[PDB]
Amino acid sequence: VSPIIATILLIAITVVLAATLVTILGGFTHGVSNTVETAGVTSHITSKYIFINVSSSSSAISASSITI
Amino acid sequence: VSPIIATILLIAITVVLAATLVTILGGFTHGVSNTVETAGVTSHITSKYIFINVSSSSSAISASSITI
Numbered sequence: 001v002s003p004i005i006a007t008i009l010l011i012a013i014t015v016v017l018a019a020t021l022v023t024i025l026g027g028f029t030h031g032v033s034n035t036v037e038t039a040g041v042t043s044h045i046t047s048k049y050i051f052i053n054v055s056s057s058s059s060a061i062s063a064s065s066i067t068i
Numbered sequence: 069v070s071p072i073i074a075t076i077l078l079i080a081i082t083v084v085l086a087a088t089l090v091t092i093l094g095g096f097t098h099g100v101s102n103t104v105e106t107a108g109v110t111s112h113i114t115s116k117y118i119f120i121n122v123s124s125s126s127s128a129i130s131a132s133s134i135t136i
């Protein structure tokens with residue numbers, strides 16, 4: 001009797017460890033993305049205005065997505 | 069006479085112990101199953117909506133079986 005019952009208990013424990021491991025991995029598998037951008041920019045500053053002129057960029061992006 | 073009668077009584081007792089043991093074992097031999105699942109999930113949160121996008125999963129499961 002007892003060696004089979006001990007085996008059933010060890011299977012039950014194994015499933016909870018595997019379920020625990022899955023929640024540990026979730027802390028690694030997020031928030032990685034390609035955020036690199038590169039632009040040819042020139043600028044001139046005066047007592048009233050900053051002028052900004054763009055010559056090229058790595059990608060086309062919305063002017064609302066850029067913070068100054 | 070008496071050694072045979074004593075033997076018949078011990079057989080009767082033995083059956084009730086075996087029947088008792090069978091009901092003890094029934095508390096072990098249930099409720100063990102493979103419950104592990106694992107998914108590639110990404111999400112974005114706003115003042116009005118949560119977006120959830122799934123990239124892969126360990127198995128195909130009903131959206132009614134998942135609790136949020």
Ligand SMILES: *[C@@H]1O[C@H](CO)[C@H](O)[C@H](O[C@@H]2O[C@H](CO)[C@@H](O[C@@H]3O[C@H](CS(=O)(=O)O)[C@H](O)[C@H](O[C@H]4O[C@H](CO[C@H]5O[C@H](CO)[C@@H](O)[C@H](O)[C@@H]5O)[C@@H](O)[C@H](O[C@H]5O[C@H](CO)[C@@H](O)[C@H](O)[C@@H]5O)[C@@H]4O)[C@H]3O[C@@H]3O[C@H]([C@H](O)CO)[C@H](O)[C@H](O)[C@H]3O)[C@H](O)[C@H]2O)[C@H]1O
Nearest residue numbers: 062063064065110111112113114116117118119120121122
């Ligand atoms: C999962 O997989 C999916 C599918 O591939 C997606 O890839 C998802 O990624 C998310 O997608 C959503 C939806 O595309 C993204 O939400 C958008 O976020 C942008 C910000 S961003 O910097 O431009 O990238 C915008 O906020 C966009 O909103 C648009 O709609 C706004 C509201 O317009 C709605 O209502 C008007 C009426 O008032 C309607 O006429 C119109 O048709 C529409 O229904 C606009 O205001 C907005 O304009 C400006 O928005 C931002 C400032 O907020 C600015 O930066 C922009 O340049 C632009 O000038 C823009 O046109 C979001 O889209 C969703 O739109 C719904 C709407 O119901 C239509 O479906 C909501 O109302 C919200 O507006 C918004 O959720 C999200 O960023 C991605 O992560 C993957 O995760």
